[PDB]
JSON list of C-alpha atoms and ligand atoms in Angstrom, two decimals:
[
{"chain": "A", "resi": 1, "resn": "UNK", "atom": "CA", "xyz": [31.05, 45.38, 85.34]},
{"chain": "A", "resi": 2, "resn": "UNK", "atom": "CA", "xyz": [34.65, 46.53, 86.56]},
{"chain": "A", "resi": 3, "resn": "UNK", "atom": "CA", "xyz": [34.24, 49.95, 88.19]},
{"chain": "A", "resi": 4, "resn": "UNK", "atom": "CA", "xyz": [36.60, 52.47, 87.34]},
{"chain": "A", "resi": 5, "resn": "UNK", "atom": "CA", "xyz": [38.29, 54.41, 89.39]},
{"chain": "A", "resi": 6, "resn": "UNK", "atom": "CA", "xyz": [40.65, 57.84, 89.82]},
{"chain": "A", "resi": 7, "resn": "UNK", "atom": "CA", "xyz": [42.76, 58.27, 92.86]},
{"chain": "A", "resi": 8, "resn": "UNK", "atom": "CA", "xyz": [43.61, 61.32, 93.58]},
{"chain": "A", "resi": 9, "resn": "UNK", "atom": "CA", "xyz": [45.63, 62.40, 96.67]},
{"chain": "A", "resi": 10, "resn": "UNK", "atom": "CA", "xyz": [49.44, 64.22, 96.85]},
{"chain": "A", "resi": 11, "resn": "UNK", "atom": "CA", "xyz": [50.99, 61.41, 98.83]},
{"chain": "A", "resi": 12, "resn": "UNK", "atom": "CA", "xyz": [52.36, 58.74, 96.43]},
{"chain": "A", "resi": 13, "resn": "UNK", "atom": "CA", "xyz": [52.66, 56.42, 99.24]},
{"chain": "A", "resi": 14, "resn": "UNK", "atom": "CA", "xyz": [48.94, 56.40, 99.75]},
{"chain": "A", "resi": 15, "resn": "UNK", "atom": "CA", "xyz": [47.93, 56.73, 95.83]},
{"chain": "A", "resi": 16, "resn": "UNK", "atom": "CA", "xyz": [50.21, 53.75, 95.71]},
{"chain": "A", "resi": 17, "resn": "UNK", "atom": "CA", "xyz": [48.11, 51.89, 98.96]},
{"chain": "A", "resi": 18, "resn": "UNK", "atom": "CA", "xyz": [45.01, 52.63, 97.41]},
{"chain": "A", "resi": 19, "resn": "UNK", "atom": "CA", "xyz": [45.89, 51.29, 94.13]},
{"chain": "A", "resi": 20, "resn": "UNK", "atom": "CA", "xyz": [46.48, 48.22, 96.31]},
{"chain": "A", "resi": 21, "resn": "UNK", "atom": "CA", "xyz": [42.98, 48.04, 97.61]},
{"chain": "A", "resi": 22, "resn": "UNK", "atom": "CA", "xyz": [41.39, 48.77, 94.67]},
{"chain": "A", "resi": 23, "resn": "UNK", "atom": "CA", "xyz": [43.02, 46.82, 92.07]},
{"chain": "A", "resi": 24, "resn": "UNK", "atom": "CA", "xyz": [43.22, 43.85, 94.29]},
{"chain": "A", "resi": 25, "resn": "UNK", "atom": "CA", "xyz": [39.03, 43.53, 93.49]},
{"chain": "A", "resi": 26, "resn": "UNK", "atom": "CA", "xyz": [37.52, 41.74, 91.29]},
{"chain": "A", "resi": 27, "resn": "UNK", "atom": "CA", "xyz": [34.89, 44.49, 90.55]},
{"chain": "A", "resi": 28, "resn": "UNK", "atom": "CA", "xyz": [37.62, 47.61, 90.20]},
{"chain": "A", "resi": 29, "resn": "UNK", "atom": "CA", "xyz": [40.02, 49.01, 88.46]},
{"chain": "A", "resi": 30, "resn": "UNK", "atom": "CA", "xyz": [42.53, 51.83, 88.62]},
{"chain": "A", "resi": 31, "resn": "UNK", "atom": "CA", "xyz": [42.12, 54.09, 85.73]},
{"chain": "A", "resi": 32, "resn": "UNK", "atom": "CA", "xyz": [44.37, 56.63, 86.35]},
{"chain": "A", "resi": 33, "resn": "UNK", "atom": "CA", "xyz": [46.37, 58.50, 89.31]},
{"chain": "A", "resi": 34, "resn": "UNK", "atom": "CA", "xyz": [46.37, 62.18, 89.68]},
{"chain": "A", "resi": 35, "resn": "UNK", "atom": "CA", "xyz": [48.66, 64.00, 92.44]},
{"chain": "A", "resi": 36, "resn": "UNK", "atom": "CA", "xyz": [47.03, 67.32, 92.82]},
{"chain": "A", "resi": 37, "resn": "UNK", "atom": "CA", "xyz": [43.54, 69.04, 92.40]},
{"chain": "A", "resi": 38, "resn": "UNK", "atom": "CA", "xyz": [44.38, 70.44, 88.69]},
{"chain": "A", "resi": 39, "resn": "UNK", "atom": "CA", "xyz": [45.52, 67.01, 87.46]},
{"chain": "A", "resi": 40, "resn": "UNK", "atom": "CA", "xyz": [42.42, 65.62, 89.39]},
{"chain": "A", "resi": 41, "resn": "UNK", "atom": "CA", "xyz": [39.98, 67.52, 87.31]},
{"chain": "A", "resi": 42, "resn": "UNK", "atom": "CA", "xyz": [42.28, 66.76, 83.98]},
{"chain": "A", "resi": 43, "resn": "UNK", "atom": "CA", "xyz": [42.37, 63.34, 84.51]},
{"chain": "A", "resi": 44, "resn": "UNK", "atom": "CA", "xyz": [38.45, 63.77, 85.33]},
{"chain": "A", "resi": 45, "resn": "UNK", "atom": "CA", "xyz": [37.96, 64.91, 82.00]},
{"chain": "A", "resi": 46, "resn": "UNK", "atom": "CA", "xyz": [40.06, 62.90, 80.05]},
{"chain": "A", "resi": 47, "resn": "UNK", "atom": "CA", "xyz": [39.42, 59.06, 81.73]},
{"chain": "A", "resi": 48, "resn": "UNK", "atom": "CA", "xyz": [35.49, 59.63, 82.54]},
{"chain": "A", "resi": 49, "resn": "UNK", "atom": "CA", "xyz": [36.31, 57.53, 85.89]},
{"chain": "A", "resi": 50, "resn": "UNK", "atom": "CA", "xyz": [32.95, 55.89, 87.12]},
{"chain": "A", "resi": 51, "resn": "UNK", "atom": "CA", "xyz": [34.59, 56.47, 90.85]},
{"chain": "A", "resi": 52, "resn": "UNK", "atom": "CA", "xyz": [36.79, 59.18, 92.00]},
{"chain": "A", "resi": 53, "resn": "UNK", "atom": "CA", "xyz": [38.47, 58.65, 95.38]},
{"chain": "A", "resi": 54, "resn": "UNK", "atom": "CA", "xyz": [39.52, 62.60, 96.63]},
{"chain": "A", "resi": 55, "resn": "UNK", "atom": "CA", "xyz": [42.44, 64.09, 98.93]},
{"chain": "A", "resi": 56, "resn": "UNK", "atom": "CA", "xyz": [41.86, 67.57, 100.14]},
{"chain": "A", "resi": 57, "resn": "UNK", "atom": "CA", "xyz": [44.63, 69.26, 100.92]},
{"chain": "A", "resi": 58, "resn": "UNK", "atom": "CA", "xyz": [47.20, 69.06, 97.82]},
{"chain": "A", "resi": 59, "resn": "UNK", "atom": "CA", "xyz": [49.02, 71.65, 95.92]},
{"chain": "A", "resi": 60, "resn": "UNK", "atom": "CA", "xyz": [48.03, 73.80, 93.52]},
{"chain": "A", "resi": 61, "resn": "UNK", "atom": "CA", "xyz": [44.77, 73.20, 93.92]},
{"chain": "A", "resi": 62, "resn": "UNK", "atom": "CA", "xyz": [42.74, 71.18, 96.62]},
{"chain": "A", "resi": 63, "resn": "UNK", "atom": "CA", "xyz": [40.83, 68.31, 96.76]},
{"chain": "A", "resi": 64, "resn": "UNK", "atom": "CA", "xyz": [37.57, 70.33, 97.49]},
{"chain": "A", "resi": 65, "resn": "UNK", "atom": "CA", "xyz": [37.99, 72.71, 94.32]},
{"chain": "A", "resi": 66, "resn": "UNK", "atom": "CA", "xyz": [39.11, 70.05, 92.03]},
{"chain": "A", "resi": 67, "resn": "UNK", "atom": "CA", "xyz": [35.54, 68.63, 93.13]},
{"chain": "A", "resi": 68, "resn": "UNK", "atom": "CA", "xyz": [33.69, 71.80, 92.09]},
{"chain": "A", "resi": 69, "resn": "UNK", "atom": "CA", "xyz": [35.18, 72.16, 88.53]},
{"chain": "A", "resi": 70, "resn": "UNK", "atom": "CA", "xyz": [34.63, 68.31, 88.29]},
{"chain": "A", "resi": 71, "resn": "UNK", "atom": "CA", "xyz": [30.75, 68.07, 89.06]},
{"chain": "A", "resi": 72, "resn": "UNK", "atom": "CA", "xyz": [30.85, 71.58, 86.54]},
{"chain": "A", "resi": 73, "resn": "UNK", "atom": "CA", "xyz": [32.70, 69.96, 83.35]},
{"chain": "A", "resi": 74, "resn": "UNK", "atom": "CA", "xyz": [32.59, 66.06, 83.78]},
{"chain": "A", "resi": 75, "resn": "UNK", "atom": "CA", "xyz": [30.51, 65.22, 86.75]},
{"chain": "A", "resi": 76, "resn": "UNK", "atom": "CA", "xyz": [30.77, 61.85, 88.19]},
{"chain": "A", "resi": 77, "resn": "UNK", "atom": "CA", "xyz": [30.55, 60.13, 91.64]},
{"chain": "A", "resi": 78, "resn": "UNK", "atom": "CA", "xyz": [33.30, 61.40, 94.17]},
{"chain": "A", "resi": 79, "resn": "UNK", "atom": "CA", "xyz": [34.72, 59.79, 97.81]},
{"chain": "A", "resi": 80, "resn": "UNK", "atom": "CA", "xyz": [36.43, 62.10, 99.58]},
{"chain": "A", "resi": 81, "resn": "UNK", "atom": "CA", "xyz": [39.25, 60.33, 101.47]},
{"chain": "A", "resi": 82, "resn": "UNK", "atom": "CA", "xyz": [41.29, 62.77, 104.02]},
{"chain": "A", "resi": 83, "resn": "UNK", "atom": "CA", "xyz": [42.44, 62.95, 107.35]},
{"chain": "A", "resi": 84, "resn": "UNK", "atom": "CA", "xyz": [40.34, 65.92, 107.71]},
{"chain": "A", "resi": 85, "resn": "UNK", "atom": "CA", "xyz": [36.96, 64.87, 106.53]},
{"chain": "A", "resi": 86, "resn": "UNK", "atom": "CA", "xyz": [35.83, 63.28, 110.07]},
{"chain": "A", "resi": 87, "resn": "UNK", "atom": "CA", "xyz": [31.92, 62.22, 111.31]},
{"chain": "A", "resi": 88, "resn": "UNK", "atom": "CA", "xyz": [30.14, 66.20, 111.25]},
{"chain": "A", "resi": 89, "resn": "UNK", "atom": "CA", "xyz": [33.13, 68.31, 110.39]},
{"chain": "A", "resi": 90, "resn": "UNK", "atom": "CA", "xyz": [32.25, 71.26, 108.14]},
{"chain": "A", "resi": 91, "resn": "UNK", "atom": "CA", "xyz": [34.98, 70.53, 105.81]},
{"chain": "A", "resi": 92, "resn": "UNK", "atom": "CA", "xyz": [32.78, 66.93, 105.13]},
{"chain": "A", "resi": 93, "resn": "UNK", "atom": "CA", "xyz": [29.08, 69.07, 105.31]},
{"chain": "A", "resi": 94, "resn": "UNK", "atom": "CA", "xyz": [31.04, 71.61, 102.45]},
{"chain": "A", "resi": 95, "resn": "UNK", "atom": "CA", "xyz": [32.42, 68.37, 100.60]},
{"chain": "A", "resi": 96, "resn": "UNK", "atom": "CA", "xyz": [28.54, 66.83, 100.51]},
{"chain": "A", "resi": 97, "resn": "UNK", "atom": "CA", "xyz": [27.16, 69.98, 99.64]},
{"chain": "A", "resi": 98, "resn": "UNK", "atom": "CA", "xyz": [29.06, 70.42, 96.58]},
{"chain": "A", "resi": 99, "resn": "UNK", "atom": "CA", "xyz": [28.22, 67.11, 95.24]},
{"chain": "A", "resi": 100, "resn": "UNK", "atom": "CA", "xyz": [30.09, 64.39, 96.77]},
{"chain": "A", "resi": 101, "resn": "UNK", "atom": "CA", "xyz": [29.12, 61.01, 97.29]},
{"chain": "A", "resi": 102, "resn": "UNK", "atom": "CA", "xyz": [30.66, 59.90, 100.86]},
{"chain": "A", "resi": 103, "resn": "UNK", "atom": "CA", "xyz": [33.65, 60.21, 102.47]},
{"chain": "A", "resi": 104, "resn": "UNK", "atom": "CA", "xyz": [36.55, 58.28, 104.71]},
{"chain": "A", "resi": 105, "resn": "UNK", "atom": "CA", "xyz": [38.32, 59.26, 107.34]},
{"chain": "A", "resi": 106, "resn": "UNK", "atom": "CA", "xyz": [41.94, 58.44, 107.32]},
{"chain": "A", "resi": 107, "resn": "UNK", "atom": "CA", "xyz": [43.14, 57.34, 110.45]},
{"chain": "A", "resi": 108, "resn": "UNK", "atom": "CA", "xyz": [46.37, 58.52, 112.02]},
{"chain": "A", "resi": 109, "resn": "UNK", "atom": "CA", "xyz": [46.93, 61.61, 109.49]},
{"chain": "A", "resi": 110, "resn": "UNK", "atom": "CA", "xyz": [47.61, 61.92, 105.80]},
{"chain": "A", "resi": 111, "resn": "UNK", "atom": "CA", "xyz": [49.92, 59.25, 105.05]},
{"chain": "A", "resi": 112, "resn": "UNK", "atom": "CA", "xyz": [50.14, 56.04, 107.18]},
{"chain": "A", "resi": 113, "resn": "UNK", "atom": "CA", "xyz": [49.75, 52.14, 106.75]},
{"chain": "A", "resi": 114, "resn": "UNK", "atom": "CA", "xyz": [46.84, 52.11, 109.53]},
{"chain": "A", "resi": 115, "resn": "UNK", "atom": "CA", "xyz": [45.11, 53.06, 106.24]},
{"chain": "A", "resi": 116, "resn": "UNK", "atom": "CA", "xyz": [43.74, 49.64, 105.41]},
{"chain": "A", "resi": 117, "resn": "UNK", "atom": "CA", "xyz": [41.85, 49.90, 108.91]},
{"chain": "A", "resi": 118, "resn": "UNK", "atom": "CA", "xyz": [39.16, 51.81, 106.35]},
{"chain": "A", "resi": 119, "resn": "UNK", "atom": "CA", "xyz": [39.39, 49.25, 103.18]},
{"chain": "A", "resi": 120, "resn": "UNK", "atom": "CA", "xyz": [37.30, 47.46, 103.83]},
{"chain": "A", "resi": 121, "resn": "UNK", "atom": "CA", "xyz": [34.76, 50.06, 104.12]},
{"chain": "A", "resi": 122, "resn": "UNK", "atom": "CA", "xyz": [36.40, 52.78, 100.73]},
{"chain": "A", "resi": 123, "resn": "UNK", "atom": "CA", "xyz": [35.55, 49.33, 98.97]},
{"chain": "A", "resi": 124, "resn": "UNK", "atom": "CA", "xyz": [32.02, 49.37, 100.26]},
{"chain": "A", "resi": 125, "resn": "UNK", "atom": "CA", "xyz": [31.43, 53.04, 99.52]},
{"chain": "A", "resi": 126, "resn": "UNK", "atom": "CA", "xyz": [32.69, 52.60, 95.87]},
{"chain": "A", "resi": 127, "resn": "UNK", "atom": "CA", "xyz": [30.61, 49.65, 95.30]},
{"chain": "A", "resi": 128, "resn": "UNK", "atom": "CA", "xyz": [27.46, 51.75, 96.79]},
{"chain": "A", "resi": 129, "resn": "UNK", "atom": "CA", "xyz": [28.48, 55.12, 94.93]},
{"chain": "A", "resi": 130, "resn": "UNK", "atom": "CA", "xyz": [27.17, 52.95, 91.76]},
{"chain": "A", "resi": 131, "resn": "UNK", "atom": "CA", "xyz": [23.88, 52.91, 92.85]},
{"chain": "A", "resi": 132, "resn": "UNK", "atom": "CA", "xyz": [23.34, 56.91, 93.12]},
{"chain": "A", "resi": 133, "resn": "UNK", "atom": "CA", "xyz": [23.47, 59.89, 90.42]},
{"chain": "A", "resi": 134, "resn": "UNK", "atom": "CA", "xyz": [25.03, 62.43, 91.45]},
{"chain": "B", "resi": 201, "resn": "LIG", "atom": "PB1", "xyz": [46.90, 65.20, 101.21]}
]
């Protein structure tokens, strides 16, 4: 019954805020951290996450090409969480498309503490992500 979850995002600041949101449920648990598209799909692999929560832009590889070779190899339910994945933007439509779940919108950029404006509703999309196959 605990759900299991990768974050995924460049920013250790925020892999280290969402760890706090996550972990701090009674229903979830951090599996496993990944700072860049190629460990993303790695880690993907490796940890069989139930819940992957994914940053776009990162180095190396992306957030939206990790989520390709993902779905390909170990496919599993993905949240994309980025400053640039807003309400209609193409960069969301592409994300959907190519077989993610949802998506958040961070609020005031990349990396900021107005982040747990959102919490409460990443929490709500993980716990709903369960009830889909993707
Ligand atoms: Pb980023």
């Amino acid at each position: 019954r605990v759900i299991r979850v990768l974050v995924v995002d460049d920013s250790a600041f925020m892999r280290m805020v969402l760890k706090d949101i996550i972990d701090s449920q009674p229903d979830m648990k951090v599996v496993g951290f990944a700072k860049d598209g190629l460990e993303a799909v790695e880690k993907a692999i490796e940890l069989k996450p139930d819940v992957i929560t994914m940053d776009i832009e990162m180095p190396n590889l992306n957030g939206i090409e990790a989520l390709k070779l993902i779905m390909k190899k170990a496919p599993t339910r993905v949240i994309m969480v980025s400053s640039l994945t807003e309400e209609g933007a193409a960069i969301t439509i592409e994300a959907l498309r190519n077989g993610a779940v949802d998506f958040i919108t961070k609020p005031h950029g990349s990396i900021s503490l107005t982040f747990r404006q959102v919490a409460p509703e990443l929490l709500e999309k993980i716990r709903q992500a369960m009830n889909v196959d993707p």
